[PDB]
Each structure stands twice: as structure tokens, then as C-alpha cells.
């Protein structure tokens, strides 16, 4: 058979359940990002509004919407068409993996920007407003977008299209493999690992730990319940970020480190299941953020509820008269 080497073995009921979870998380994340954009437009009438927070929130929402909208069709095609992993040409594969890695870098830089913004807001309240402006915020957003676009560049050079089926001339066997030697591709993968997961994990962990300690000390040396929810969110963000964004590079390290004499069919199917769990964790990471924003913010919660409705001791003083 031409596609005899492309058969990947998995439970069909697990595929149906993961597909349903993917569709549910996609719809929830899309509605969340759309309502986030609507609240971002609706809050322009506030006179004391901090426009830089609006810029960072809008950039993060745009990044989450773009990652979900790009991620859903190609991942559904890869998961359903196991006998035909990429019908499209090399240009489409390079463009889509470039855009996916660039959007990953953009949402990582947006989360890091929100973290350093709240770090400056809590640790140094004077400098957070004295040394910041909306023009510098827009410059930083454009700079991090350009940095993501520049860091996504090696995906356009070190990966291309090859036929790896039993039939050397078969449309079903087209697959995105590296065209350059494995050593330099693994170098590129390690650089994308360091820039994609390790550095924002260190930044987010250190900043959220410092913010948790500053909130613990400042308010002590319903407010206690608010501080407890603050600490819980600051821990949950770091924990969810690690457990969602680790397999993005763990799958690539598993691919590049395991040699040909070490691969087993068990490792092949575990790699495919791990890629499925990786994409599920990507959907969880892109879905939990509007729910968390609804949880932490009362105004955003109220406007989201309005959107859902649209869809469906003191002592009295005395006085004396001079006589």
C-alpha cells in the first residue's frame, strides 16, 4: 500500500471526545475573545481609564483569537487525515508553521508584558506611571510583534516538504520534514525552546512570586479574601503556563533526541498521543484566560453578563448658642 507506513493507531472514541473538547474550547475561547474586544471598545468612555492596560489586553486577546483560529483547521486536518498529513504545498506548510510559531511568541510576549506591567504597578507605583506612556506602550507592542516575526524566520528555511511514504510518487505521503541536517535543525529547535518556553516561564515565575510577596507584605504590614484570591490566581497562572507550554518543546525534544535505533511503535503512538495532549493543553491555555479575566474583573464580568443577556460607629454632633 502507498499509505501503509502512515497508519497511526488510536482509540476512535478518544478521538471523538478530544474533538468535542476541542470544538467546545474553540467556541468558548472565540466568544471570550470577541466579548473581550467588545468590552475593550465599550470602556473608552471612562475618563480615568488606563489606555495601556487596554492596549495589552487587546493585544493578548488578538493573539489568543489568532492562535485559536489558526490552530483549529490544521490540527483537525492532521488528526482526521492520518493517511494524508499535508495535501498542501511546501509554501503553505512553511507559512502556517511560521504563523503558528510567531503567534506563540506573540502571546508569550503579551503574557510577559502583562506580568511586567502588573509587577511595575505593584512594586513601584510612582515609576509605573512616571516612566510609562501610551506611545512607549505601542512601541513595545510593535517591538514584540517584530521580535516574534523575526524569531519565527528559521521555520521558513529549516523545514520543507518531502515524500516519506512507501510509494515514492504519492500525494498522501507529502509531509513537512527538515531539509537541512539534523544537527543545525536541533540547534534551531533548542533556540526556539529557550525563547518560547524557558525565558517566559522564568519571567512569569519570578514576577508572580515577587507580586505575591509584595501583596502579602503590603496589605498586612473582605480584603483578606481578595488577597487569598490574588495569591491563588498568581500561583495558578504560573502553574497553568508551565503545564500547558512545556509539551510544545517536550514533543520537539522527543522528536530530535530519539535516534532511529531507539524508536518503537509504542514510542510512535505515544508521540502522537503526546502531540494530541499538547494541542489540548494549547486549547486549555487559550481558553482559560477570558474566564480568568471574567473572574478577576467585576466590570468585565458585568458586561459579559449583559452580553449573555443580549444573546438570550458614628455619633451625632451637637451645637450651642452663645449667650
Amino acid at each position: 500500500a502507498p499509505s501503509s507506513e502512515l497508519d497511526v493507531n488510536t482509540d476512535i472514541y478518544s478521538k471523538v471526545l478530544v474533538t468535542a473538547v476541542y470544538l467546545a474550547l474553540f467556541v468558548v475561547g472565540t466568544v471570550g475573545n470577541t466579548v473581550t474586544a467588545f468590552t475593550l471598545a465599550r470602556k473608552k468612555s471612562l475618563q480615568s481609564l488606563q489606555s495601556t492596560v487596554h492596549y495589552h489586553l487587546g493585544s493578548l486577546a488578538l493573539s489568543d483569537l489568532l492562535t485559536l483560529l489558526l490552530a483549529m483547521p490544521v490540527e483537525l486536518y492532521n488528526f482526521i487525515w492520518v493517511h494524508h498529513p499535508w495535501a498542501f504545498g511546501d509554501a503553505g506548510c512553511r507559512g502556517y508553521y511560521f504563523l503558528r510559531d510567531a503567534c506563540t511568541y506573540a502571546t508569550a510576549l503579551n503574557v510577559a508584558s502583562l506580568s511586567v506591567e502588573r509587577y511595575l504597578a505593584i512594586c513601584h507605583p510612582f515609576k509605573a506611571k512616571t516612566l510609562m506612556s501610551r506611545s512607549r506602550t505601542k512601541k513595545f507592542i510593535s517591538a514584540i510583534w517584530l521580535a516574534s516575526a523575526l524569531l519565527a524566520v528559521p521555520m521558513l528555511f529549516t523545514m520543507g516538504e518531502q515524500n516519506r511514504s512507501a510509494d515514492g510518487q504519492h500525494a498522501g505521503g507529502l509531509v513537512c520534514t527538515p531539509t537541512i541536517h539534523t544537527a543545525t535543525v536541533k540547534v534551531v529547535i533548542q533556540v526556539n525552546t529557550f525563547m518560547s518556553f524557558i525565558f517566559p516561564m522564568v519571567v512569569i515565575s519570578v514576577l508572580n512570586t515577587i507580586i505575591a510577596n509584595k501583596l502579602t507584605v503590603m496589605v498586612r504590614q473582605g480584603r483578606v479574601q481578595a488577597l487569598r484570591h490574588g495569591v491563588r490566581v498568581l500561583r495558578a497562572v504560573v502553574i497553568a503556563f508551565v503545564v500547558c507550554w512545556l509539551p510544545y518543546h517536550v514533543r520537539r525534544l522527543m522528536f530530535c533526541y530519539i535516534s532511529d535505533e531507539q524508536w518503537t511503535p509504542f514510542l510512535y503512538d505515544f508521540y502522537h498521543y503526546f502531540y494530541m495532549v499538547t494541542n489540548a493543553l494549547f486549547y486549555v491555555s487559550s481558553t482559560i484566560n477570558p474566564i480568568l479575566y471574567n473572574l478577576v474583573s467585576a466590570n468585565f464580568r458585568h458586561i459579559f453578563l449583559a452580553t449573555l443577556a443580549c444573546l438570550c460607629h458614628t455619633l451625632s454632633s451637637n451645637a450651642t448658642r452663645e449667650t
Partner: peptide, 5 residues
């Protein structure tokens, strides 16, 4: 062995 990176 897997074929896609």
C-alpha cells in the same frame, strides 16, 4: 519512527 517534526 515518526516522520513529521
Amino acid at each position: 519512527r515518526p516522520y513529521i517534526l
